[PDB]
């Protein structure tokens, strides 16, 4: 809702800054094993608990 | 009409975010956390669940202060600076 408290507002900001893919240069380092982002979230798939 | 029809009326919250442990377990009307027992002085813990004890025991966090005690013990809790250092 438009009515929000500051604590909930702070949480929503962090949840969308953690929702971007990995940069390209990470995949070219020596001894790398990360392929994609395994913690991607979508508003239509998984519900975050507040 | 129990079931699909009745599930549509769920738009309230029994629990909110606890100020001490961070889980969504604070009861809104009782004002008591169902996980850590806030606002009691002690933390909720029972011996009939070993899984629950290990999820929050010492060492599962940052150890901001306690992780530097072994090094200070080994050198004898000394104070000062090494000999003719500058400063």
């Amino acid at each position: 809702p438009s009515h929000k408290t500051f604590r909930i507002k702070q949480k929503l900001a962090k949840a969308q800054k953690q929702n971007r893919p990995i940069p390209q240069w990470i995949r070219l380092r020596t001894g790398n094993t990360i392929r994609y982002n395994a913690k991607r979230r979508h508003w239509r798939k998984t519900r975050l608990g507040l | 009409t129990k079931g699909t029809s009745s599930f549509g009326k769920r738009h309230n919250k029994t629990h909110g975010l606890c100020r001490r442990c961070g889980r969504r377990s604070l009861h809104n009307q009782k004002k008591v956390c169902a996980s850590c027992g806030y606002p009691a002085a002690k933390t909720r813990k029972y011996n009939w669940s070993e899984k629950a004890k290990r999820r929050k025991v010492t060492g599962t966090g940052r150890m901001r202060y306690l992780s530097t005690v072994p090094r200070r013990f080994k050198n004898g809790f000394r104070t000062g600076v090494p000999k003719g250092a500058r400063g």
Binding site: - | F77, R86, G87
Partner: protein, 122 residues
């Protein structure tokens, strides 16, 4: 430049350190302000500037505490942050003077009958 070295900082009083801190601060802000709309060799200057600020703050702080410890020498009560920090349990222990006291009666016995050095022949 924008890269100060701790070697020369130790031989100055507080007036120089404060004004050096001010000059370093204004320069860092300006480079941040004009950081946008361009990019180049000034990118690493900001890193040198904020590390230089940390060095000056460290030297100012250390010179202050040394003076305070000299002031409270030969005083009964010191501020809490200048008291030694060993451990809560180690701070409650009986002092060596008190833990090694004995009664008058037990002292007179040790004067005249202590443990001796002896041997037994075969």
């Amino acid at each position: 430049n924008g890269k100060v070295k701790a070697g020369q900082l130790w031989s100055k009083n507080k007036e120089e350190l404060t004004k050096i801190l001010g000059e370093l601060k204004t320069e860092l802000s300006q480079l941040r302000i004009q950081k946008i709309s361009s990019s180049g060799a000034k990118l690493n200057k900001i890193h040198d500037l904020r590390k230089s600020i940390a060095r000056v703050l460290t030297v100012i702080n250390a010179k202050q505490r040394a003076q305070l410890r000299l002031f409270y020498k030969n005083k009964k009560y010191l501020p809490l942050d200048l008291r030694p920090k060993l451990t809560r349990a180690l701070r409650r222990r009986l002092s060596k003077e008190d833990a090694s006291r004995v009664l008058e009666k037990t002292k007179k016995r040790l004067t005249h009958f202590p443990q001796r050095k002896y041997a037994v022949k075969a």
